[PDB]
Amino acid sequence: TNKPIVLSTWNFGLHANVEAWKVLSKGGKALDAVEKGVRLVEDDPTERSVGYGGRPDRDGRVTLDACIMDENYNIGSVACMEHIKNPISVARAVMEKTPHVMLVGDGALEFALSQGFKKENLLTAESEKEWKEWLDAIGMIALDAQGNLSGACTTSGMAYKMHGRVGDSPIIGAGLFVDNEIGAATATGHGEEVIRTVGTHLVVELMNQGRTPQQACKEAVERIVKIVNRRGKNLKDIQVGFIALNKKGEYGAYCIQDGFNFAVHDQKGNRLETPGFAL
């Protein structure tokens, strides 16, 4: 087993990975490492797709989505929540502190305030300016030193989405799925398409059915390529990629289109790698 190891989506994943490695390199839990890592990007206002610099919906509101899943089937999720900069920690709190698994809208903000999170204005002058002018997610999965898996996914969703729109990031089996006997996967791309195909639950069930992380990501994407063609859609218009990790610390990735990148931090260091791709 290659462990610990963290992977996360896109360039900003390298930095997010340095925060996660601070936990993991000291034999910390995968759960704490992935929450710590994606929180770095939620706090960053120049990170315009996750938390605090997020581009608002078409009504000018920054509403955030997130979910988390640990090594023993516990899960927490929040969607279309406003004024809380760290939705991954409110999602963790849904998991640890309620009988429920997903809270949305005003009920999710009411629960967050009840837990001590502080209401903040997440609309930056830069995002407000671009919004009025107009008028993706970070996923991270990790295997810690105990050989346990966890993942976290967080986004501001599509810029100028309809008020109330939810993507794949707060949905288990769409933006994130972890099963500690098999592996973990997180998704990148168009929310709607990852939901439609329930993509990450499919990646992990193909690792369950014997596939390598890389093979599983590729076959999943290829299943998605066949569905957009059956839907009569042009592949150039839709993107979807996955990164995956199994129990032995092997990892893989694949996407419909070229141009995505993901960060891998293990004991060889942190690096940006480039997936295989179909088109």
Side-chain angles (χ1 to χ4, degrees):
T1 307
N2 173 30
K3 67 181 187 280
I5 173 160
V6 219
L7 325 213
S8 58
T9 64
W10 299 110
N11 301 58
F12 51 28
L14 271 181
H15 324 330
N17 274 13
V18 177
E19 298 315 303
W21 199 246
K22 287 174 173 176
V23 174
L24 301 174
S25 63
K26 301 290 169 58
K29 290 148 91 193
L31 191 56
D32 294 312
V34 295
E35 168 188 33
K36 209 289 201 68
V38 296
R39 267 189 153 249
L40 178 82
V41 181
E42 292 175 338
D43 287 332
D44 196 347
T46 63
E47 223 61 70
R48 311 285 308 284
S49 66
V50 184
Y52 185 22
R55 291 189 185 88
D57 60 35
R58 67 186 209 195
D59 297 354
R61 307 193 166 220
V62 175
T63 75
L64 313 187
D65 309 330
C67 71
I68 195 176
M69 177 158 205
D70 78 359
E71 78 294 340
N72 200 30
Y73 307 97
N74 303 117
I75 49 160
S77 160
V78 288
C80 190
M81 182 185 59
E82 260 190 280
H83 316 289
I84 301 310
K85 176 173 76 217
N86 298 291
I88 197 65
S89 311
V90 185
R92 181 166 181 169
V94 169
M95 183 171 72
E96 300 177 329
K97 305 303 191 94
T98 85
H100 295 327
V101 124
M102 178 176 208
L103 294 183
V104 301
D106 309 331
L109 171 60
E110 296 153 34
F111 168 76
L113 294 172
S114 91
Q115 293 315 300
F117 290 79
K118 294 309 287 163
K119 189 175 198 298
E120 296 186 46
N121 182 0
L122 315 176
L123 222 206
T124 64
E126 177 187 32
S127 291
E128 187 208 288
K129 174 170 178 44
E130 301 183 356
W131 169 55
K132 284 183 192 157
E133 292 187 303
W134 173 83
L135 280 175
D136 100 325
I138 182 176
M140 175 179 285
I141 50 184
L143 179 67
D144 63 25
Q146 286 150 97
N148 288 333
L149 289 161
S150 295
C153 188
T154 179
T155 191
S156 36
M158 183 190 129
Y160 321 123
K161 64 196 175 182
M162 295 172 67
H163 184 54
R165 173 277 183 177
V166 175
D168 64 300
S169 319
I171 296 164
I172 301 298
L176 174 76
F177 193 68
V178 174
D179 182 317
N180 205 50
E181 268 61 34
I182 303 157
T186 11
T188 196
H190 292 70
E192 286 72 17
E193 304 308 311
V194 183
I195 293 173
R196 154 180 286 136
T197 61
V198 198
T200 241
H201 183 68
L202 176 67
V203 171
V204 172
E205 185 61 31
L206 296 173
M207 289 194 272
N208 186 24
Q209 296 164 53
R211 285 174 93 45
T212 271
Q214 172 50 36
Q215 287 164 354
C217 294
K218 192 177 195 306
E219 185 178 347
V221 155
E222 289 174 342
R223 281 187 201 197
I224 300 176
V225 167
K226 305 307 193 70
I227 292 166
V228 339
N229 174 245
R230 298 206 286 251
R231 298 184 76 242
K233 300 291 171 183
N234 194 112
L235 209 56
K236 194 80 193 196
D237 296 326
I238 113 98
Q239 176 60 310
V240 171
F242 303 95
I243 50 181
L245 199 44
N246 68 18
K247 284 317 292 302
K248 308 234 72 209
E250 282 155 1
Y251 63 97
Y254 202 86
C255 323
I256 288 180
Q257 313 206 46
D258 199 20
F260 163 80
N261 50 90
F262 62 94
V264 196
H265 196 326
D266 54 21
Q267 294 111 96
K268 249 210 159 102
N270 195 21
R271 61 244 177 213
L272 208 55
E273 296 194 6
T274 302
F277 58 100
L279 186 46

mmCIF file of all heavy atoms in Angstrom, residues 141-159:
data_model
loop_
_atom_site.group_PDB
_atom_site.id
_atom_site.type_symbol
_atom_site.label_atom_id
_atom_site.label_comp_id
_atom_site.label_asym_id
_atom_site.label_seq_id
_atom_site.Cartn_x
_atom_site.Cartn_y
_atom_site.Cartn_z
ATOM 1 N N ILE A 141 -9.708 13.568 -2.106
ATOM 2 C CA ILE A 141 -9.847 12.243 -1.541
ATOM 3 C C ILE A 141 -8.490 11.846 -0.972
ATOM 4 O O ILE A 141 -7.450 12.236 -1.535
ATOM 5 C CB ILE A 141 -10.304 11.238 -2.621
ATOM 6 C CG1 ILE A 141 -9.442 11.286 -3.939
ATOM 7 C CG2 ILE A 141 -11.820 11.544 -2.878
ATOM 8 C CD1 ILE A 141 -10.048 10.325 -5.001
ATOM 9 N N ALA A 142 -8.461 11.149 0.162
ATOM 10 C CA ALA A 142 -7.220 10.820 0.803
ATOM 11 C C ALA A 142 -7.256 9.464 1.487
ATOM 12 O O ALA A 142 -8.322 9.031 1.969
ATOM 13 C CB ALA A 142 -6.858 11.836 1.896
ATOM 14 N N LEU A 143 -6.071 8.813 1.565
ATOM 15 C CA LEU A 143 -5.874 7.574 2.319
ATOM 16 C C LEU A 143 -4.819 7.951 3.372
ATOM 17 O O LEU A 143 -3.728 8.449 3.051
ATOM 18 C CB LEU A 143 -5.353 6.457 1.388
ATOM 19 C CG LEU A 143 -5.026 5.044 1.925
ATOM 20 C CD1 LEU A 143 -6.277 4.413 2.350
ATOM 21 C CD2 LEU A 143 -4.418 4.167 0.862
ATOM 22 N N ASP A 144 -5.151 7.843 4.641
ATOM 23 C CA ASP A 144 -4.254 8.196 5.717
ATOM 24 C C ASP A 144 -3.352 7.007 6.095
ATOM 25 O O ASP A 144 -3.414 5.914 5.488
ATOM 26 C CB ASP A 144 -5.115 8.656 6.923
ATOM 27 C CG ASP A 144 -6.067 7.656 7.590
ATOM 28 O OD1 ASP A 144 -5.875 6.435 7.536
ATOM 29 O OD2 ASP A 144 -7.030 8.085 8.219
ATOM 30 N N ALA A 145 -2.471 7.158 7.115
ATOM 31 C CA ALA A 145 -1.597 6.085 7.598
ATOM 32 C C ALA A 145 -2.275 4.857 8.150
ATOM 33 O O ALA A 145 -1.624 3.823 8.143
ATOM 34 C CB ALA A 145 -0.692 6.525 8.726
ATOM 35 N N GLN A 146 -3.541 4.904 8.611
ATOM 36 C CA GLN A 146 -4.260 3.737 9.114
ATOM 37 C C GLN A 146 -4.866 2.968 7.983
ATOM 38 O O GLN A 146 -5.500 1.923 8.179
ATOM 39 C CB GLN A 146 -5.439 4.066 9.968
ATOM 40 C CG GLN A 146 -5.218 4.567 11.369
ATOM 41 C CD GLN A 146 -6.363 5.516 11.780
ATOM 42 O OE1 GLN A 146 -7.280 5.050 12.436
ATOM 43 N NE2 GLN A 146 -6.370 6.825 11.456
ATOM 44 N N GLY A 147 -4.719 3.501 6.763
ATOM 45 C CA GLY A 147 -5.293 2.810 5.625
ATOM 46 C C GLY A 147 -6.788 3.078 5.480
ATOM 47 O O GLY A 147 -7.482 2.251 4.893
ATOM 48 N N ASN A 148 -7.278 4.188 6.020
ATOM 49 C CA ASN A 148 -8.662 4.667 5.911
ATOM 50 C C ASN A 148 -8.782 5.816 4.939
ATOM 51 O O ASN A 148 -7.961 6.736 4.882
ATOM 52 C CB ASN A 148 -9.202 5.165 7.279
ATOM 53 C CG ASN A 148 -9.480 4.044 8.267
ATOM 54 O OD1 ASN A 148 -9.762 2.899 7.870
ATOM 55 N ND2 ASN A 148 -9.285 4.274 9.549
ATOM 56 N N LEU A 149 -9.868 5.816 4.238
ATOM 57 C CA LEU A 149 -10.201 6.773 3.170
ATOM 58 C C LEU A 149 -11.175 7.865 3.576
ATOM 59 O O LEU A 149 -12.033 7.566 4.401
ATOM 60 C CB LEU A 149 -10.831 6.006 1.992
ATOM 61 C CG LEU A 149 -9.946 5.103 1.134
ATOM 62 C CD1 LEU A 149 -10.819 4.130 0.371
ATOM 63 C CD2 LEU A 149 -9.121 5.973 0.136
ATOM 64 N N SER A 150 -11.103 9.112 3.131
ATOM 65 C CA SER A 150 -12.186 10.062 3.270
ATOM 66 C C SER A 150 -12.140 11.052 2.120
ATOM 67 O O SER A 150 -11.160 11.099 1.356
ATOM 68 C CB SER A 150 -12.073 10.768 4.612
ATOM 69 O OG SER A 150 -12.254 9.901 5.726
ATOM 70 N N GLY A 151 -13.217 11.785 1.879
ATOM 71 C CA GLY A 151 -13.255 12.773 0.808
ATOM 72 C C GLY A 151 -14.143 13.963 1.155
ATOM 73 O O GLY A 151 -14.972 13.930 2.071
ATOM 74 N N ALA A 152 -13.937 15.041 0.421
ATOM 75 C CA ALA A 152 -14.629 16.281 0.634
ATOM 76 C C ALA A 152 -14.763 16.925 -0.734
ATOM 77 O O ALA A 152 -13.845 16.769 -1.559
ATOM 78 C CB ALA A 152 -13.763 17.146 1.598
ATOM 79 N N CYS A 153 -15.901 17.592 -1.006
ATOM 80 C CA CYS A 153 -16.136 18.223 -2.294
ATOM 81 C C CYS A 153 -16.756 19.556 -1.950
ATOM 82 O O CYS A 153 -17.598 19.567 -1.050
ATOM 83 C CB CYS A 153 -17.110 17.377 -3.177
ATOM 84 S SG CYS A 153 -17.092 18.166 -4.814
ATOM 85 N N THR A 154 -16.375 20.693 -2.556
ATOM 86 C CA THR A 154 -16.959 21.965 -2.218
ATOM 87 C C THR A 154 -16.873 22.901 -3.433
ATOM 88 O O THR A 154 -15.880 22.858 -4.172
ATOM 89 C CB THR A 154 -16.202 22.440 -0.812
ATOM 90 O OG1 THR A 154 -16.753 23.718 -0.462
ATOM 91 C CG2 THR A 154 -14.675 22.607 -0.849
ATOM 92 N N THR A 155 -17.913 23.723 -3.665
ATOM 93 C CA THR A 155 -18.028 24.608 -4.802
ATOM 94 C C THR A 155 -18.965 25.804 -4.555
ATOM 95 O O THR A 155 -19.741 25.861 -3.575
ATOM 96 C CB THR A 155 -18.551 23.845 -5.991
ATOM 97 O OG1 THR A 155 -18.391 24.726 -7.121
ATOM 98 C CG2 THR A 155 -20.038 23.441 -5.834
ATOM 99 N N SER A 156 -18.898 26.831 -5.430
ATOM 100 C CA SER A 156 -19.940 27.853 -5.495
ATOM 101 C C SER A 156 -20.830 27.530 -6.705
ATOM 102 O O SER A 156 -21.849 28.183 -6.951
ATOM 103 C CB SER A 156 -19.343 29.272 -5.589
ATOM 104 O OG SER A 156 -18.179 29.284 -6.367
ATOM 105 N N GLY A 157 -20.577 26.430 -7.381
ATOM 106 C CA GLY A 157 -21.500 26.075 -8.426
ATOM 107 C C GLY A 157 -21.291 26.968 -9.622
ATOM 108 O O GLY A 157 -20.369 27.782 -9.687
ATOM 109 N N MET A 158 -22.220 26.826 -10.549
ATOM 110 C CA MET A 158 -22.078 27.479 -11.860
ATOM 111 C C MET A 158 -22.214 28.974 -11.679
ATOM 112 O O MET A 158 -23.113 29.371 -10.951
ATOM 113 C CB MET A 158 -23.163 26.903 -12.793
ATOM 114 C CG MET A 158 -23.124 27.409 -14.216
ATOM 115 S SD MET A 158 -24.644 26.829 -15.033
ATOM 116 C CE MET A 158 -25.494 28.189 -15.841
ATOM 117 N N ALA A 159 -21.350 29.828 -12.211
ATOM 118 C CA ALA A 159 -21.579 31.270 -12.025
ATOM 119 C C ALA A 159 -22.846 31.622 -12.798
ATOM 120 O O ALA A 159 -23.152 31.089 -13.873
ATOM 121 C CB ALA A 159 -20.387 32.137 -12.564
#
